[PDB]
Amino acid sequence: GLSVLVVCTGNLCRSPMAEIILRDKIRQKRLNIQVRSAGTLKTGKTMPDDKALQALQDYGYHPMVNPVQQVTQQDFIEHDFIYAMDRTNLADLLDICPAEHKNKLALFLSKANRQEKEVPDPYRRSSEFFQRTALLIESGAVALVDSWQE
Amino acid sequence: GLSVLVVCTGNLCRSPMAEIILRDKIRQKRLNIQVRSAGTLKTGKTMPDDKALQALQDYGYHPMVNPVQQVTQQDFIEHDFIYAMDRTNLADLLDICPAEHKNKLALFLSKANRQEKEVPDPYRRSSEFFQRTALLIESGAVALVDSWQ
């Protein structure tokens, strides 16, 4: 059958989510297409992010998940199409994709008739908000320390 | 000396961040104040969240960290002040604080002269964003399935 690979930076959130969702919709439509996911960067992790998996459960998907893996050279040959979650992902694959297979590269959102062209990284968004929390807590802490000396 | 407790739901993010930041500011002025943190809800976890700690490092704090712990009744007697990061925390504390000690309870931001009176939960925001991330991915997936068939 057909072979599809989905790729984000760490294979921790976005691309594993797409794999699980694609697999399900493929099985609903009884298509003979298999799907995997991979990251551009070697992470130390074994399994995808728990918060990715819980969001899939909230929407009725069963997250039975493959181990995290980084993209390889054989992936560009063995797979029929390969989808990138954001432009940075698409660039790094093109950076290392031999010219014979570069037409197989595309952004994940390319067939959805929507304004959004990249799916943004939830992890960077997460970090931004934790950094924002720190600043608010810092402001609170300074006031408490003042009040205490009074 | 003075003893201060700061409290969130899981003792994973807001309250340990506050403990570490408070400890730094107390030691900067060599005040005789101790600070600890605790959660209203018993989770199984041992240490706070990695991204709470990294966010502290990003701002130059050195996160030396106590194990996660749940608030106890001894906490309401042993501590001089007890701060809830948000109203949900303050409500859960009022539920189990003996009436003799409820005057020790206050919102963490009660002395910051700001609009914000609650520190919003980064975990709930994060969860919201993963859900909207999934929906964007799902709509993408549906389109991909169509073009193939």
Author numbering:
A (entry chain B): 5 to 154
B (entry chain A): 5 to 153
Question: How do the authors describe this structure?
Answer:
VpsU is a 166-amino-acid cytoplasmic protein containing the hallmark C(X)5R motif of the low-molecular-weight phosphotyrosine phosphatase (LMW-PTP) superfamily. We next determined the crystal structure of VpsU at 2.2-Å resolution. The two molecules in the asymmetric unit form a domain-swapped dimer. The overall fold of each monomer is similar to that of other prokaryotic and eukaryotic LMW-PTPs. It contains a central four-stranded parallel β-sheet flanked by two α-helices on one side and three α-helices on the other side. VpsU contains the same complement of active site residues as other prokaryotic LMW-PTPs including the nucleophilic cysteine (C12) and the tyrosine (Y127) that stacks with the substrate phosphotyrosine. In the crystal, domain swapping in the dimer occurs through exchange of the C-terminal α-helix (α5). Although size-exclusion chromatography data were consistent with dimerization, we cannot be sure that domain swapping also occurs in solution. In a steady-state kinetic analysis of the wild-type activity, we measured the KM to be 0.9 ± 0.1 mM and the kcat to be 1.4 ± 0.1 min-1. These findings suggest that VpsU has phosphotyrosine phosphatase activity and that cysteine 12 is necessary for catalytic activity. Collectively, these results show that VpsU dephosphorylates VpsO in vitro.
Here, we show that a tyrosine phosphoregulatory system controls the biosynthesis and abundance of Vibrio exopolysaccharide (VPS), an essential biofilm component of the pathogen Vibrio cholerae. The phosphorylation state of the tyrosine autokinase VpsO, mediated by the tyrosine phosphatase VpsU, directly modulates VPS production and also affects the kinase’s own degradation, to regulate VPS production. We found that VpsO and VpsU have respective kinase and phosphatase functions, and we have determined crystal structures of VpsU and the VpsO catalytic domain. We found that the VpsU tyrosine phosphatase controls VPS production through regulation of the VpsO phosphorylation state. Together, our data suggest that the phosphorylation state of the C-terminal tail of VpsO, modulated by autokinase and VpsU phosphatase activity, regulates the functional state of VpsO to control VPS production and biofilm formation in V. cholerae.
